[PDB]
Design a protein around this nucleic acid. Structure first.
Lengths: 482, 418
DNA sequence: GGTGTTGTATTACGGGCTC
DNA sequence: GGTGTTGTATTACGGGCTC
DNA sequence: TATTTGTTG
DNA sequence: GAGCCCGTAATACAACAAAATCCAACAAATA
């Protein structure tokens, strides 16, 4: 009741095992690779195959014909004889003591990629997918801008947001103004202090998150009528707002420094933190963000040994030339910064390249007790390739919330594989309903359930309405949805 | 109200400034360093000091007398003239464009280690503060046991709630202890599942209430079982059980992707699969690390032999001795490999007595206490004992704090200054 | 179009001395 | 006494060929 | 028109 | 040097790091 109790006279290893017998040469279609391998064996010396009365094997390892390759890898990777769906190393440690397999490790990683569950249950450093591509460098004094929110701040006047940090990306002026959750939700007063910030110059590009305070229809349309883009994030990918969040990281330390009176009276400290942080020189540019835009430094001059040029508070008709010169200086420092970021981060990262049409797994941010249950969900078809690291995909039918996912969550899908066929008739959706595998959910627009069947096209689902839903046992269906 | 409006004929730079003046040399106590610096200046050629109407300075930067060093670095580090308590780089960028200060970087890092708020507020990767220094490897089989569990899973039918694991430090043998998130009957289930093999020598676990457990600890003291009892929010010591539940979580997801709420049936399959699969740091299946009797035997392994340990009856002593020797050297290899690939940046901290160390609001306050933008102003504690190479006990100025063991990943030793 | 980014101790590289 | 530790793609190093 | 219910900093 | 195949076999890199509630607030779905 084992394998190998069967003859196979037509496979790749025939030319290898007729080196001693030389009986018959029964090659098949596209089997000339066996003859080329035999020629390669003849021009070298690696002849060590042991041949004894149909027990043909290597020095201590049983060579396997290519017909039952899938049988062997399924035997020692799946659970028929206690495998466990492990990585390539454990699969080698199970197979390489027993079998030879020319290009063994390549075949093993191929089986790891072409499995049905093995892609979706495991993980291998998804954070480093996609090379680090910095956003466009700079513009004319914060025509590109970023902002973000962080919470958890203690109340003082029911003000438990208080972090609306806006970072003047070119000069990194990095303003932040006290606020609260309950003041506005981008309707009445949020825009008003947004404009009193913007009173010192309208921007031209926003980069922000998928927060509900900026995904609203009111915010996007008013910005579009203002001629300012949105460029939101990618469903819990705050690295798009990196420089604002890095400012927060610098802000948090200074907030703890100034936060001795944590509860009583401390809203005076945010303008103090602003004035301190802007005047302090940074690292990536060598000049303080206060003097990059405004030219001069603040009061009490501590003018350095360069020139008197940092005390530029005089006649303004010649400001344009040297302020543009400083713009050139800072621009050069930002190509240096982009190069420095791309050096030390892309060393381990590997880009992911997908064309439109191929399937892709999302592995997170699809269903918000997610410990033992299948938190990782099935494959979807990519629609729009916004960037090399930005794929728009159909995770559900048409429901909600910005169907583009960053490549960090995204993962390639491989369907190389007795698979069944595609039911298209009306009577084939009722009988072939007990062959289901997983579930996505219920359509919000009408009554139509989307699910996965077995040994079929995974992404190309078949619609199953209530007329063929109650007959099959649905007791085990909502268990994976709950 | 500006500075430098004062003459100082008694400082270190007097010997440097008399290279042009040669008039008065009123040196002070411990000013023999000025003599050596002047000698080094004389045997070299680096004369760039400018003497202009009491403003003695460098090529473009003002050298400052050592009397007002602390005043200047406090002025450019605190908010008196808008510093901000930043690091050495921003402090240099504030000072070095205007001042020279021989060995400025060392003076500034000394000031950073001097200023108290920078010690209490900054972190500067407080996860690399001690060497690896792993557990002692092993003894004879089933003598060291690692204990931990994940608190909550999606509940089954209301009889089982969470999974507890027992894997020994030597052989890493999986186990299926399915508890109910428990009571003092922990010793019942735990006894039934380790006493299948036998009583260990030490238990490597966390300070969990089911194991801190004064009722359960006295049982171990009477029976002859030690207790490492890894400190508050430092789960690294548990190790083998943590790595097993890492492997168990993937296995439990694999076997219960479509079969949630009844994973207790598949839990023995989880542990049997973990047991039959060879690992990397030992290279053998945990059956083979124990009495090697992989019962499935789908095919004979490499270096084909009898491979039937059932046939052997009395000669098992030499076989277990051979397995013990090779697995002990493999454990030592795993230890040294871990130490090499981890200690490339781990800076040691060896104090062992008489310091005033801190604990930066982790294992000091509650794990359930929320971490926020609230100030981190833990007071200067004290250390009285060297409990281990990688931790120091403290005299926690509270009611009891229920524990006083702090692993080096939270200390960040406080340094005073007269 | 839309996707990281600086603060920070820490450490590496040139003038000037001994050769 | 008491304090990390393996699974995993990924990548580096020897026999055998061309030299 | 109030009470819901998907998803997201 | 110079590269290539192939077959093992080391190799840093990250996951176990308690679990799961909402908070505030956009917009869909009925009745």
């Amino acid at each position: 009741s084992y394998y190998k109790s069967d003859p196979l006279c037509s496979a790749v290893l025939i030319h290898m095992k007729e080196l001693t017998q030389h009986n018959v040469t029964p090659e098949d279609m596209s089997a000339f690779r066996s003859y080329q391998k035999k020629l390669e064996l003849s021009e070298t010396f690696r002849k060590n195959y042991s041949l004894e009365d149909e027990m043909i094997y290597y020095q201590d390892r049983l060579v396997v014909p290519i017909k039952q390759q899938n049988a062997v890898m399924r035997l020692y990777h799946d659970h028929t004889l206690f495998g466990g769906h492990f990585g390539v190393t454990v699969t080698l440690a199970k197979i390489s003591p027993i079998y030879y397999w020319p290009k063994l490790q390549h075949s093993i990683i191929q089986y790891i990629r072409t499995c049905v569950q093995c892609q979706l249950i495991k993980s291998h450093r998804p954070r480093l997918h996609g090379l680090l591509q910095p956003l466009p460098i700079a513009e004319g004094r914060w025509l590109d801008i970023s902002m973000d929110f962080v919470t958890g701040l203690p109340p003082t006047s029911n003000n438990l947001n208080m972090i609306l940090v806006v970072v003047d990306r070119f000069s990194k002026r990095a303003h932040f103004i006290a606020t609260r959750k309950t003041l506005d939700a981008t309707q009445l007063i949020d825009l008003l202090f947004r404009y009193i910030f913007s009173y010192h110059g309208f921007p031209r590009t926003i980069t922000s998150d998928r927060d509900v305070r900026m995904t609203a229809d009111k915010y996007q349309e008013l910005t579009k009528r203002l001629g300012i883009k949105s460029t939101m994030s990618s469903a819990n990918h705050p690295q798009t707002d990196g420089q604002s969040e890095r400012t927060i990281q610098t802000l948090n330390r200074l907030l703890r420094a100034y936060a001795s009176t944590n509860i009583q009276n401390w809203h005076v400290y945010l303008p103090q933190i602003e004035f301190v942080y802007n005047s302090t020189p940074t690292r990536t540019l060598g000049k303080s963000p206060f003097e990059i835009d405004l030219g001069y430094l603040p009061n009490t001059p501590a003018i350095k040994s360069d020139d008197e040029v940092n005390a530029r508070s005089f006649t303004a008709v010649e400001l344009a030339k040297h302020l543009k010169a400083l713009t050139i200086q800072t621009k050069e420092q930002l190509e240096h910064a982009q190069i420095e970021m791309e050096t030390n981060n892309n060393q381990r990262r590997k880009p992911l390249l997908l064309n439109i049409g191929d399937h892709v797994l999302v592995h997170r941010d699809a269903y918000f007790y997610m410990k033992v249950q299948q938190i990782y969900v099935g494959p979807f078809r990519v629609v729009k390739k916004i960037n090399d690291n930005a794929y728009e995909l159909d995770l559900n039918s048409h429901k909600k919330k910005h169907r583009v996912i960053n490549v960090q969550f995204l993962k390639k899908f491989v369907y190389r594989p007795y698979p069944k066929n595609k039911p298209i008739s009306s009577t084939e959706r009722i009988k072939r309903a007990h062959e289901v595998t997983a579930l996505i959910g219920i359509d919000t627009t009408h009554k139509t359930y989307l699910c996965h069947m077995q040994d079929v096209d995974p992404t190309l689902s078949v619609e199953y309405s209530e007329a063929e839903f109650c007959q099959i046992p649905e007791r085990t269906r909502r268990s994976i949805l709950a």
